[PDB]
Symmetry: D2
Subunit: 265 residues, 4 copies
């Protein structure tokens, strides 16, 4: 062929070996998406379960995914540092994750909301990015970062929508009322003025959602030395593992991580 040379213009990006990979997916324009389909505000319970169902399905399909954290319209997936899925090609990994979440979300949406058929100009789409982390302390810090943001965003939105719904404020006056406020202020506004105790909100709303792969007889046998069938049996054992869902603090509960050593290696 006189034309096949054009293949030489392609550039693959192989992610640095032996590094933890985070794949973060985030809904595109989900403010508009959540408005169009009338999410309950501040939080739509069934909408989050769709995200979570989507995430668990993806995670059960790919044994390299060790840990998942989701809230709002985002999910973060931790791939083990020795992951060889698609030879660690960033193009493959990211475009497959954004494709899967889109389609899994679309599938499960038709299950949970049969009376809200999707409009062609409002299908659920997601982006995806890969981030490399060379040390597990950065992994701890990454998920702590994301859970802290969930708290802040959930506290704000719960406060915001209660100002609108309980006090019959317009969005603009709700926003202005909150400018200049810290976490303790919003809590006071919610309790004293709206009659809502934030601490009594659902654990899923306050903490977000953790989906983690659970192993029973784990020994830190995973090493560079052993290979071939050992790797393949380990691939099989990872596939035949169980997914558990939690709504807990992972920021300050160090024992939670320590009792799950397969996350680091």
């Amino acid at each position: 062929s006189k034309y096949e040379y054009v293949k030489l213009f392609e550039k693959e990006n192989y992610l640095l070996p032996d590094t933890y990979i985070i794949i973060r997916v985030d809904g595109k324009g989900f403010h508009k998406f959540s408005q169009f389909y009338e999410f309950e505000k501040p939080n739509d319970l069934k909408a989050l379960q769709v995200m979570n169902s989507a995430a668990e399905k993806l995670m059960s399909k790919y044994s390299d995914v060790m840990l998942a954290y989701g809230d709002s319209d985002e999910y973060s997936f931790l791939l083990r540092k020795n992951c060889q899925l698609y030879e660690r090609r960033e193009m493959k990994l990211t475009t497959l994750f954004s494709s899967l979440m889109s389609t899994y979300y679309m599938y499960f949406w038709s299950q949970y909301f049969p009376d809200k058929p999707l409009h062609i100009d409002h299908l659920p789409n997601f982006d995806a990015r890969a981030v490399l982390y060379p040390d597990f302390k950065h992994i701890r810090n990454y998920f702590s970062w994301r859970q802290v943001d969930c708290h802040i965003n959930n506290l704000y939105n719960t406060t915001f929508w209660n100002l609108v719904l309980k006090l019959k404020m317009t969005p603009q006056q709700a926003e202005q009322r909150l400018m200049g406020t810290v976490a303790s202020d919003k809590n006071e506004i919610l309790f004293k003025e709206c009659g809502v105790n934030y601490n009594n909100e659902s654990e899923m709303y306050k903490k977000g959602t953790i989906i983690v792969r659970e192993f029973e007889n784990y020994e830190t046998e995973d090493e560079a030395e052993l290979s071939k069938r050992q790797v393949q049996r380990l691939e099989k054992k990872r596939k035949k593992a169980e997914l558990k869902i939690y709504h807990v603090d992972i920021i300050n509960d160090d024992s939670w991580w320590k009792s799950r050593p397969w996350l680091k290696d």
Copy 2:
């Protein structure tokens, strides 16, 4: 925050300015997908119509897409060289396209196949890659490359699948019969033994599908010099331009390209 530092590990890739971008999407495991959902062989008309509807819909949402070419389970989209969609971020462009094609396919499938509901373990997924080409001659050669591949593959599958169904050969025997064969050989087997004239095959099957944006009073006004209201008005005309579908040779027809100068600019 003591954790937000983790954002610094993210790495963006901004694609070289003033260069043509090709985004190519390809179905994940569509051999299996086409078997599970019982596609007609060698070509399933409605399946391609699902593909064609998706790409046209995608292309109509994004005025920077000037031209698209599809055959089998793939589509290639040409972005104009001064495209600023998502600031030419490689991650954004590819994960958006893979997500869009995925959901549009899923949407249109339910239109064309109400009697074949999608199964959760067989959803339509796509990869997506971006390729840069610094000269339009490479764009012509790229699409020539894909259409030639369309010709070769359709001929093989038409010959292959007529050998199994008409001559009652097994898969191995048809493949074995074809080992060592060129186009004229395949063409003769079709004519003389199977009683099929390849030239009488649908133009879409032979040539594939081209979706192109058409302009009527085009002048090469596009230059770096004019700006402000000038550019946004042309952006408005690009969205309000028409997409026409063709099943024609674009390999050897220079006049086809020459009469479409907006492809170059």
Copy 3:
């Protein structure tokens, strides 16, 4: 070997085919360097000749370099569009150019400055970066950018040092006198206050230095179609072409570029 695996952590960057490469080199910490060895101000003639000699020697060794532009402590080298030097590896190209410039400068320094032996803590070091340009119009604009930069800095330095040297102003007052001034203002300060006609300054100081590869019987014979020994013959011809130095405008003189079409190929 159980340790040779570490080679797999290396990541090569192959620069996009069929694109103009600009390699720009700029002296590291040459302000201090020029002070340490007591360079003449604003311009040291023998100092610029060391740079030009270094660059020309480099350019005569690497036939892929079609054009070079230098001023101050910098040189830019244009690599032909179809350059395959080190397989277009960015690492090889840039670290080779910075090393070459550093040692050639050092060699020629000992030629031009026998009376100023180099001190180990003040050796001439250079960085180097590669930049891709998909269209020759950006190459024209690149060199225009640099020559304008040359004019601006030379005009400033000539004005600055005439304020210090003729009018016995302090550096601080010379610097404060010029803040907020455009070219017409600086020209007058030189004329009315310093009695200097800027146009009588050396052409090299005003315009910088262009080193160009010159061909006599050139025909645009270059195409993908011609190959094998034909390309090898074109390499010998390119290696053995004459290098000419100019101190002229290249910003506005379109005819200068048009009569040297091999730069575009």
Copy 4:
């Protein structure tokens, strides 16, 4: 300015934070270089000392370099994992190192070989590449890798050249004699045929050269929390710490590495 837009085509590459950086420099065409200047064989003592001085000089100016290893025409530099030199820009780091090693070599060459002035067509040039390693075990294995290669090449070259110089063999007969041989065969050839004990070779020749930053009162005082003035005092101590040279096994002497914990941080 209408031409300054061309700056936007530049692409920086910021190396992953919190990862070990190895920089390896290697002499360009040093086979030919060592012939032209008539190096002693197998090992030229003064030529290696030129290399060692360059590396030691380079290392004393840049305190982020924690360890260096050299043999033949190569030197590898370990940058501490929290290095912020040039904001971890790969282009700056590599072209600085290739320039520095080249000029330091040229400088020190004139000190050790006043009687062998450098010819302009045979100056000492170096390439340079940055390699990332996410775990310190790879740093150990890297230097193990390079020292093993030094052993292999020095044992071979010493045996080879003793065959040529002592037994008056031609290069070709010496080469075939060594084809198919492991270390014990080569050692025996040295012992039984040439009367040379390899173990009595200089430690520098056998092991290469290790340059290490030595700390006396080191505690792993480095953490993310400590910053500002703590870091500036720490930077000053690293700069004014002492460089010690060793010619010892670092492959298998774990206690050697273990007693130097500042290497991991």
